[PDB]
Amino acid sequence: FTLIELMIVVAIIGILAAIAIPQYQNYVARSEGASALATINPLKTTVEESLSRGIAGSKIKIGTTASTATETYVGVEPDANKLGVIAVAIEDSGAGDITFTFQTGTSSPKNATKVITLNRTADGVWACKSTQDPMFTPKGCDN
Amino acid sequence: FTLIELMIVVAIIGILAAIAIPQYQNYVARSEGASALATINPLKTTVEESLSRGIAGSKIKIGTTASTATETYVGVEPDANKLGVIAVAIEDSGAGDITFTFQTGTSSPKNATKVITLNRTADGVWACKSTQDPMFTPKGCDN
Amino acid sequence: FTLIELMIVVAIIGILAAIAIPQYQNYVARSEGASALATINPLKTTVEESLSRGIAGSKIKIGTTASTATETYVGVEPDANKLGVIAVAIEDSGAGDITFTFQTGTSSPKNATKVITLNRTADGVWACKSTQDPMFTPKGCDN
């Protein structure tokens, strides 16, 4: 062994120890929101079916407790998605809101304690809102 | 040659022979599970299609033996993924379970002999479970 | 200067001239295959899109000659990767094979003149094969 090889190796080590690293948080922050809505959107179909068939609101709940000719139970647990929690509460007058609240022990720091919601007016119009940042909100709701 | 250069080279060799090395097993242990579910999830689409079209269960199998107007064969071999083996067995009553068992001759030591499963209740609800550690289980199932 | 220092230096030189060197060929032989498949896998998406949209096979080629409403040209040159050459030839009946042939003037000696292939059956099943050694074949194909 000589000093030339060792010095060249030391120099190449320092050269390699210079690669830059860009940001990688917005990607996950957007992927979380792209999944939350994709998971909590289909419930509108069951809500509309239950409201148009004949049964009134309130009885519409979540979980996995079978079904009957009076109450409706969509086949998803309140904590099926480990990213957050889902909550539904349809009033007797048809108006209601299905909300998804991000959990702090699973979701990302930016999307922590944030809430998305889909509301149904009394006449029968579906709107949606969220509390996340503008760049992280999906391309289907406001803020 | 002198003793100064040789001693400096020997000292620099010992200095370089001190770089620490962190852990690198959890990465592969999690990547294996992230691929297992991603590979064995899409079968639910074919299962639901076969159960809703008209054909009964049981006949639903795996492999590559073409298809007809009675039996269904999803286009994947039972050992397509070298990490483990897949097994499906839908009962005549619709209830069934698609399982993925990790092999010992390919999978990692931690994820060896572990089994993931996706079950379909009689009424028509999809659940999933696994036997891996909590930190290695994907963010879509329990333990 | 004395003889003690010179003899000690000569002895330390011989001592240092004894470091062993392990093998380092399998690493590159496996890295080449890990890159070949990673580069030539995504073409299946374009193949399936072109076969399911409406246009027939044959017209599907490679290079960079723009696109139109009849022919498809995936944005990669036949020699984009300097490790080998890519070749696609989809038949009119949908069946085809995308192959990657390693070049002798760039690839390693072990992975020289070897060929990987991804075939599409007539019914619509994707299989893959290779001609490399068992230990160098990726964990997604046979031999």
From Swiss-Prot, chains A, B, C:
GO BP, one annotated term: type IV pilus-dependent motility
Annotated positions of the N-methylphenylalanine modification: 1
Keywords attached to this entry: Cell inner membrane, Cell membrane, Disulfide bond, Fimbrium, Host endoplasmic reticulum, Host membrane, Membrane, Methylation, Transmembrane, Transmembrane helix
GO cellular component: cell surface; cytosol; host cell endoplasmic reticulum membrane; pilus; plasma membrane; type IV pilus
Reported impact of residue 1 to C: Loss of processing by PilD
UniProt membrane topology term: Single-pass membrane protein
PROSITE patterns: PROKAR_NTER_METHYL
Covalent S-S links between cysteines: 128-141
Primary residence: other
Gene knockout outcome: Mutants show a significant reduction in the efficiency of extracellular protein secretion. They are also defective in twitching motility.
Record localization: Fimbrium; Cell inner membrane; Host endoplasmic reticulum membrane
Membrane-spanning residues: 1-21
InterPro entries, sorted: N_methyl_site, Pilin, Pilin-like, T4P/T2SS_Core
PTM remark: Methylated by prepilin peptidase PilD at the amino group of the N-terminal phenylalanine once the leader sequence is cleaved.
Family annotation (Pfam families): N_methyl (PF07963), Pilin (PF00114)
Gene3D superfamilies according to UniProt: Glycoprotein, Type 4 Pilin
Subunit structure: Interacts with itself to form a multimeric tubular filament structure with a diameter of 51 Angstroms. Interacts with PilJ. Interacts with PilS at the inner membrane. Interacts with type II secretion system (T2SS) components XcpT, XcpU and XcpW.
Entry function: Major component of the type IV pilus (T4P) that plays a role in surface and host cell adhesion, colonization, biofilm maturation, virulence, and twitching, a form of surface-associated motility facilitated by cycles of extension, adhesion, and retraction of T4P fibers. In addition, plays a critical role in type II secretion of exoenzymes by interacting with specific components such as XcpT or XcpU. Modulates host calcium signaling through interaction with host calcium-modulating cyclophilin ligand.
Family from the record: Belongs to the N-Me-Phe pilin family.
Domain notes: PilA subunits constituting the T4P exhibit a classical pilin fold featuring an extended N-terminal alpha-helix linked to a C-terminal globular beta-sheet-containing domain, which are packed tightly along the pilus. The N-terminal helices constitute the pilus core where they stabilize the tubular assembly via hydrophobic interactions. The alpha-helical core of the pilus is surrounded by the C-terminal globular domain of PilA that coats the outer surface of the pilus, mediating interactions with the surrounding environment.
Protein name as catalogued: Type IV major pilin protein PilA
Organism: Pseudomonas aeruginosa (strain ATCC 15692 / DSM 22644 / CIP 104116 / JCM 14847 / LMG 12228 / 1C / PRS 101 / PAO1)
Highest classification ranks of the organism: Bacteria, Pseudomonadati, Pseudomonadota, Gammaproteobacteria, Pseudomonadales
Gene: pilA
